[PDB]
Design a protein around this ligand. Structure first.
Ligand code: COH
Length: 152
């Protein structure tokens, strides 16, 4: 688990995301799609996006970024007491969307990257550590659900 100090860092960082949820959301998704094009193929509604200019100009991609980060923010604010919130997410992503756990690693790394990119010099070593732990926790709790399902 994360310490009290660590959770506070996590939710302090998250303050940055909340000031522009859609912008953070869109950049996370573009980072994931451009770095890992296989991920784009899991989204029938975004596989028409051939170029980053197209991604950037997509209002629906931004809308989805908002849905994504809002769901993640909800989970983070539970400070690890997220079973009710995380279970349905785990299950829709395995069973419906067929998302390998690797893709959840990719988006975790994309969040850390976007935070440095939007907030250079304002995402300290301690904040990065805390946020990384929170994201691993999220990822690991999802992985336990995936194992239950025998997915991947
Ligand atoms: C590589 C693709 C992948 C990743 C890493 C990912 C990672 C994450 C993630 C990690 C931070 C969070 C909090 C969410 C949260 C959500 N995702 Co995804 N999702 C992904 C692919 C999808 C797909 C595909 C859908 C359906 C999109 C649609 O057509 O509306 C989706 C839908 C959702 C929805 C709508 C409800 C539902 O269908 O469950 C939420 C909320 N999610 N997702």
């Amino acid at each position: 688990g994360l310490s009290d100090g660590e959770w506070q860092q996590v939710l302090n960082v998250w303050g940055k995301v909340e000031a522009d949820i859609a912008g953070h959301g869109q950049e996370v998704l573009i980072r994931l799609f451009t770095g890992h094009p296989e991920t784009l193929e899991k989204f029938d509604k975004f596989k028409h996006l051939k170029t980053e200019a197209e991604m950037k100009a997509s209002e629906d991609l931004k809308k989805h970024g908002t849905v994504v980060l809002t769901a993640l923010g909800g989970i983070l604010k539970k400070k690890g007491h997220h079973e009710a919130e995380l279970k349905p997410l785990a299950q829709s992503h395995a069973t419906k969307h067929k998302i390998p756990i690797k893709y959840l690693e990719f988006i975790s790394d994309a969040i850390i990257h976007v935070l440095h990119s939007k907030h250079p010099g304002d995402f300290g070593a301690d904040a990065q550590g805390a946020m990384t732990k929170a994201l691993e926790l999220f990822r690991n709790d999802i992985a336990a659900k995936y194992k239950e399902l025998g997915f991947q």
